[PDB]
Design a protein around this nucleic acid. Structure first.
Lengths: 49, 97, 97
DNA sequence: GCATTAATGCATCCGCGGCCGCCCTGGAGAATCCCGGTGCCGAGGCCGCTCAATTGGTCGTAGACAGCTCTAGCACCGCTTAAACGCAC
DNA sequence: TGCGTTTAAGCGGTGCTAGAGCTGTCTACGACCAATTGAGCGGCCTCGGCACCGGGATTCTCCAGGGCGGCCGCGGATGCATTAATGC
């Protein structure tokens, strides 16, 4: 995870980041730092709670 | 040619990391179930809260780190590095037990 | 032929003699002189009772003998019979000093 | 037909040589320090409450002040052993 | 550990006086209670300090190639043994 984030902040190394449901709930601290344009949920019946 | 650290090199860095850090080194649930079962035999139907456990935890690991420190002193006095049984036996005997 | 005991054999018999004896090993005059010197460099024109001296020497010989078995245990831990400086220093450090 | 004697298949004992591992020097890679960078959350300044510290008076009470009493600490004297010190193996 | 000696405590006894110990007395001096108000305290909501990770400069450890004196595979001899054509 740190290896994937070694070029995470400064350059535009990726135009889209694909993350699992249960990894955001662990890396919120790193995720909320970056600014995003489009964020999409798949099968939102899980997040219906 | 894989890069392997020689034995004892990482020990110094774990010591450095742990000496600057003051967090509990014992998992919470094993400690709390240990406390519950040892309080069982004295008298049944115990009740423990979120507090009244961390105090025991902290007293315990402070006592244990002090014991490890003077065990290190005794082992150094034995002109060796590896700890052994009689080290903790005479540390306990000398400290007042 | 001369009758000379092997070295250390007299040590066991003198240990036996001294263990059954509860008398003090310090002469009264040197002890009193030392205590009076502590008073002299402590506070000028001090008076000493006939009592309040037995407690001094008694506590001293108790402390000395105690520290002596601690240093003896430390020495025997070192796999040697003769005591040394590190033995007494380690005993003092572990006892609480 | 039998010994026999030169031709022949190895016999096993070295001669030689193919056979490496250690120090010193060549940088190479992981770990650390350190503040931006932003999100988080609780420290505390402010608002409203309330209860006991302060004030004064009443009143009785324990301790400094002698005051005295007596008492053992000490400085001193001289005898009797008695361990301590220096030495040597 | 063992010995000659010498510096020295242990001991019997005295005269005292600085000092420990028990006792009236009053005189400071606090124990206790109306009465108040004012500081300590319960609650709250926010922004600035803090938590945690990123990017490089820096600092630390650790890898391998190369020049140092001894090597264990091999080949042949040339003896031990075998063997077949021939004189007897």
């Amino acid at each position: 995870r740190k290896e994937k984030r070694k070029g995470w902040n400064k350059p535009d190394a990726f135009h889209v980041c694909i993350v699992s449901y249960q990894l955001v709930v662990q890396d919120q601290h790193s995720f909320k730092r970056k600014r995003w344009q489009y964020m999409v949920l798949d099968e939102a019946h899980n997040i219906k709670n | 040619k894989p890069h392997r650290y020689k034995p004892g090199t990482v020990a110094l860095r774990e010591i450095r990391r742990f000496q600057k850090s003051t967090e509990l080194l014992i998992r919470k649930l094993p400690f709390q179930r240990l406390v519950r079962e040892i309080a069982q035999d004295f008298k049944t139907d115990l009740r423990f809260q979120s507090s009244a456990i961390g105090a025991l935890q902290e007293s315990v690991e402070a006592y244990l780190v002090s014991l490890f420190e003077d065990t290190n002193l005794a082992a150094i006095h034995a002109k060796r590095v590896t700890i052994q049984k009689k080290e903790i036996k005479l540390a306990r005997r000398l400290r007042g037990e």
